[model samples]
Target: SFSGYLKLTDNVYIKNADIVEEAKKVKPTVVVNAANVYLKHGGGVAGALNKATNNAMQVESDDYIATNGPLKVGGSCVLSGHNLAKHCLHVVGPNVNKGEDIQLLKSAYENFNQHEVLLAPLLSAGIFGADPIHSLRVCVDTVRTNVYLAVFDKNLYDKLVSSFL
Candidate 1:
């Protein structure tokens, strides 16, 4: 009945909420996206954030590249202003439907390098039409940070929760 949180470890927790709404509260040091290498937030969480931020995300992305260079898949950079509320972190993750979904996603988190808290979605499950459980499972197993997930699918969220129970 309620959105949930699974404390996988002291530094990692998974939760069900809207990415934008959660970002409002968490002010997460980082707002990881299932983004494209080209800074496109076309579909999925990135898409929603794109609209929510009124393209502020993209503007910041442009700035990110200007300073840090284009982001490679699994690479990350920082952003600020507008719907972001403050400076925030961003990243582009690989599509799980691809051959190296699990590995690439893991790398994205790992490449993010450092942070005390982060918010992200189960990358690639949406546009890629991949299984939510499998995608979430890979994220939970691989990412090593204090993580919060913005998940909309109640059924898949429960299935993921049940696996641990």
Candidate 2:
């Protein structure tokens, strides 16, 4: 099952599903990670994407400091020169469990084009932090994407669906 077509902004319908599978529905240009401050594509949602991408995701993740400034928490950067799913965006999310962290997660999407379809999960809701529902809601509020493939497991998926009722 999926969420009840929650509309975050115009043309953005957020629901629960598999992010990698959703990427298959389109070109799936960039799969983002709730990366660490180092931009290391090592674990959490980062690990999931890195595993699917076959270690090809780290080329930019490794060369981050030289290409752009050091990635800051709540900031975003693009990954290129990889054979993995076109590209990947590294968004450094907070490690703390504060309510303000939701704002940080939301702001990570601010730099990218609102019209772009980004296959990003509930940032910081995984190994980095907690509260998947809040993370997803903040993401919905922050970005206006042409297609936002919001993915989650049955637990939060049920919560999202019930929240609407």
Best by TM-score: 1
TM-score of model number 2:
0.76
Best by lDDT: 1
Clashing pairs in 2: none
TM-score of each: 0.79, 0.76
- Give the per-residue lDDT digits (tens) of candidate 1, residues 1-165: 113577755555666677788776656557766677667667777778877788878777777667777677677766663554354555666765555455666676674447656777776677755566766666666666667777767776677777752
- Could you tell me the TM-score of candidate 1? 0.79
The whole-model lDDT of each prediction reads 0.66, 0.63
Residue by residue across 1-165, what tens digits does model 2's lDDT show?
A: 223556655745666766655554444677666677676767666776666667766665676676675777788777761443466677777776543354576677574454276666767776766576676566666675654555567777677656732
Q: Which ten residues in a row have the lowest lDDT in candidate 1?
A: 81-90
lDDT at position 99, candidate 2: 39
